[PDB]
Design a binder for these strands. Structure first.
Lengths: 212, 209
DNA sequence: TGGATTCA
DNA sequence: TGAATCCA
């Protein structure tokens, strides 16, 4: 996969240049979203473009999150965590990385949007409140760009659709990343739809192919 | 209907105290959300409380917007307006009031939330972007409070659910209003569910002016 | 399109 | 409470 669009607030540009551990976290997110390949035996990501909305997107999110957790030591909130935390402000931020950059504890929060545009507004606001409350020091949102979203689940959020609203994050360190497949064609399998599309074992096998 | 909860940003408080026409627009919204009665023969609003999620809420919004346009001259975006005004912003602000004052044109925009909490976040951000772009000078959001929402459509946005996020509006003139029924009991019919569980005719009859 | 409803 | 289907 490739990162074809990206927006970084001035505050995040500043933070990234002066904070090595925050920059490292950002680089790990970039590596995790660019790592996906398809088919699993390929070295690039080709999306099946047979017809509109023919592929699922959650499996890609699952792969991205597992890579961050298993390979880069990020923490992904588990169902048991979500159950005990979400009572007042909704579920917690999907995944994050934490580190003591001595004198203080810092955290980078990230969310991969696989829902509709309204859910993306909620995700951006969840991250913004986290920044305002000092719970995270940098927020990152990942989304497929429009060209790719055309072949993903109906009504899924795409980079360009949330873009008019990126300015609501000015003043805070926020980064939006838009990804795309390296190729489009009908000679590859469809990414399974439903959240159950790929089991917890298929994701592991795929991750294994991605890493070696 | 009654207003039981309300949050007004410091900037909105300031604006309301110094701008009479903006204060008037705000008073019209409050009057319009307090106007609803139920059943149509009562002077009060009693919501049927016999079963969780048993009533619709869209009809209340329909009534509220109609009162603002009809009685107070607000403008509510029509299907044809929405059809031509959408690119990457996601549809115009539901209703607004415009007026000339002190060498500048001012507008107040409002949205009544009848969708799920994610849609309320989108609505708040729509309004915030309008404020930031200078297209409106005051934003207002109406929502039923949690007690009432229990008896309205499953998953509808309620005041307390969005409240933790009101602070994302500080620095901008924004107002959030939480409304409630005056009474709860079984001796009233259910409010129909859906964009038209209650016809345009019925809403016309269901006035209270 | 959005609103609603029901199944997973 | 997200996903997919269906109609006011």
């Amino acid at each position: 996969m490739e990162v074809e669009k990206e927006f970084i607030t001035d505050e995040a540009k500043e933070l990234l240049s002066k904070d090595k551990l925050i920059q490292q976290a950002y680089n790990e997110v970039k590596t995790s979203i660019c790592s996906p390949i398809w088919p699993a035996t390929s070295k690039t990501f080709t999306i099946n473009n047979t017809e509109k909305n023919c592929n699922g997107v959650v499996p890609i999110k699952e792969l991205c999150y597992t890579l961050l957790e298993d390979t880069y030591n990020w923490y992904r909130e588990k169902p048991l965590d979500i159950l005990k935390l979400e009572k007042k402000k909704g579920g917690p931020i999907d995944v994050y990385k934490e580190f003591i950059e001595n004198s203080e504890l810092k955290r980078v929060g990230m969310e991969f949007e696989t829902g509709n545009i309204s859910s993306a507004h909620r995700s951006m606001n969840k991250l913004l409140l986290g920044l305002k409350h000092g719970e995270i020091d940098l927020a990152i949102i990942l989304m497929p760009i429009k060209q790719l979203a055309y072949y993903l689940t109906d009504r899924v959020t795409n980079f360009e659709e949330l873009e008019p609203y990126f300015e609501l994050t000015e003043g805070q360190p926020f980064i939006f990343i838009g990804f795309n497949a390296e190729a489009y064609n009908s000679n590859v399998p469809l990414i399974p739809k439903g959240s159950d599309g790929m089991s917890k074992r298929s994701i592991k096998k795929w991750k294994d192919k991605v890493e070696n």
